[PDB]
Amino acid sequence: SKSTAEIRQAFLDFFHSKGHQVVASSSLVPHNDPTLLFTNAGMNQFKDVFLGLDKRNYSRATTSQRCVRAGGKHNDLENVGYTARHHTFFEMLGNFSFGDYFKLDAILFAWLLLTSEKWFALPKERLWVTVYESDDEAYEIWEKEVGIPRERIIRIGDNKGAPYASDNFWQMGDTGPCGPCTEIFYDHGDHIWGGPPGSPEEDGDRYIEIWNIVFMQFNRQADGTMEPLPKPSVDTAMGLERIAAVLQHVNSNYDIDLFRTLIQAVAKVTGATDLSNKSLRVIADHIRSCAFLIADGVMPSNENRGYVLRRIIRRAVRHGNMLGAKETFFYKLVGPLIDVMGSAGEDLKRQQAQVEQVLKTEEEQFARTLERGLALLDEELAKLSGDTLDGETAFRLYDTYGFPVDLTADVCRERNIKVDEAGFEAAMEEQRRRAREASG
């Protein structure tokens, strides 16, 4: 089959022949907005280009952007380990048109790359597409120009039950370029639970969203009002891991080449006994986020981005501990991570030791309170009559043991236990008021 690295190459090449300028992936730290926690999409570095504020010598580009969706408007952290298609760290294979080609060529390029016997050649019967309800052009293009069956062109209205809370209307974040979009889904077939988009069981992992194609029409200014973009443009992202799963004839992103090997490296250093465990996937994912974030200059901390990183690190250590890790293990996964990435882990080779060091200190510190905190937790769980852990307990784990609220929640989740988040909030606010009183 085509390997992950081969797929990334083919994609960039294909769009290069179609006149797309290959641009280097930006860092996970976004200096284009301070507003933004981490790079969450390939279009981020081109945000101001779509607006017309930032000007380039190319009218189309193509990138393989590294993204972390662990925060803000794009937060997939809690999905990690429960689906076979979600990561914190993942790569977006995307093509961009700035004032150049619009819908017809955008859809044509996508179909060509996916279906062509000469490129990488998915079964046509398997593919499904979605369009925004109002998008008649897109529908007609798929139906007439491409030749897709009407039964497989699902229209999606503002179906999240707010104007337009739509899977087919994509917005950058709180502000920025946006517009209706069309998505390409692949059927991994009958054995997986799940139905097509717009269907009750649309969330299930059978029909996977491979490629989103956003027709950039509008800009969201500040206030809610939606001004038009100077020139209609195209923004697409195909998930490298998800398409690799299709091409490599697997169903889970965690069965693709680089995850097969990465999970084995996790089993080695944790003493894990079976390779089909939730925690192995979680750790394999988290090492990608943490290692790359640090390599891009994010130092673990208690403030802002550093804290999100710290949280992910600690959550990963917690899983390793559960698997039976006898000693510091997390930093040992940097090496194997560098191998299974190669071209894409460039910056990560430069600093390897700096990253291994940061990840080592971090785990070494959390381990100082980890197991004692887990005991505190287990005690309190037994005292529980109900399915909800009191907020005071959650606050104690945070205040004393350095357990981020979501980490505690992740532990309780595995036992069908909720954590009373209102109480945690109350306890947290009560300390801010004590700090405010004492300090004045």
Ligand X SMILES: Nc1ncnc2c1ncn2[C@@H]1O[C@H](COS(=O)(=O)NC(=O)[C@@H](N)CO)[C@@H](O)[C@H]1O
From CA 50, how far away is CA 34, in angstroms rounded? 18
Q: Decide if residue 239 touches ligand X (CB under 6 A).
A: yes
Q: Residue-wise over 13-46: b if at least 16 C-beta within 10 A, else e?
A: ebbeebebeebebbbbebeeeeebbbbbbbbbbb
Instruction: At 67, give phi and psi (nearest 5°).
Output: -130, 145
Q: Are 426 and 433 in contact (CB under 8 A)?
A: no
Q: Decide if residue 241 touches ligand X (CB under 6 A).
A: yes
Q: Decide if residue 236 touches ligand X (CB under 6 A).
A: yes
Q: Decide if residue 212 touches ligand X (CB under 6 A).
A: yes
Q: For residue 235, what are the β-bridge partners?
A: 96, 214
Q: Decide if residue 321 touches ligand X (CB under 6 A).
A: no
Q: Decide if residue 44 touches ligand X (CB under 6 A).
A: no
Rounded to a whole number of angstroms, the minimum distance from the CB of residue 283 to ligand X is 16
| Cβ closest to ligand X, residue 169 vs residue 366 | 169
Rounded to a whole number of angstroms, the minimum distance from the CB of residue 96 to ligand X is 8
Q: Decide if residue 242 touches ligand X (CB under 6 A).
A: yes
What is the H or E stretch that residue 389 is in? Answer: strand 388-389
From CA 431, how far away is CA 365, in angstroms rounded? 24
Residues 283 to 312 in contact with ligand X, rule: CB under 6 A:
none
Binding test (CB under 6 A) with ligand X, winner from 214, 266, 284, 293 = 214
| Cβ closest to ligand X, residue 219 vs residue 236 | 236
Q: Decide if residue 28 touches ligand X (CB under 6 A).
A: no
| Cβ closest to ligand X, residue 183 vs residue 356 | 183
| Cβ closest to ligand X, residue 177 vs residue 336 | 177
Strands 89-97 and 226-239: antiparallel
Q: Enter the tokens of residue 396.
A: 């104690």
Query: What is the largest distance, in Å, between two alpha-carbon atoms of the chain?
Result: 72
Q: Which stretch binds ligand X (CB under 6 A): 20-28, 199-207, 233-241, 341-349?
A: 233-241
H helices, E strands: number in the chain: 14, 13
Q: Decide if residue 43 touches ligand X (CB under 6 A).
A: yes
Q: Residue-wise over 374-388: b if at least 16 C-beta within 10 A, else e?
A: bebbeebeeeeeeee
Residues 141 to 170 in contact with ligand X, rule: CB under 6 A:
170
DSSP 24: P
From CA 432, how far away is CA 110, in angstroms rounded? 52
Binding test (CB under 6 A) with ligand X, winner from 15, 38, 71, 76 = 76
Q: Which stretch binds ligand X (CB under 6 A): 54-62, 84-92, 118-126, 357-365?
A: 84-92
Which DSSP string do the residues of 120-179 spell out, in sequence order? ----TTTEEEEEETT-HHHHHIIIIII---GGGEEEE-STTSSTT--TTEEE-SSSEEEE
Residue nearest to ligand X (CB): 239
Residues 51 to 70 in contact with ligand X, rule: CB under 6 A:
69
Binding test (CB under 6 A) with ligand X, winner from 101, 211, 218, 403 = 211
Q: Are 68 and 28 in contact (CB under 8 A)?
A: yes
Rounded to a whole number of angstroms, the minimum distance from the CB of residue 87 to ligand X is 4
| Cβ closest to ligand X, residue 100 vs residue 363 | 100
Q: Enter the tokens of residue 28.
A: 């996970």
From CA 362, how far away is CA 357, in angstroms rounded? 8
Rounded to a whole number of angstroms, the minimum distance from the CB of residue 120 to ligand X is 15
Q: Decide if residue 210 touches ligand X (CB under 6 A).
A: yes
Residues that bind ligand X (CB under 6 A): 41-43, 69, 76, 86-87, 90, 92, 94, 170, 209-212, 214, 235-239, 241-242
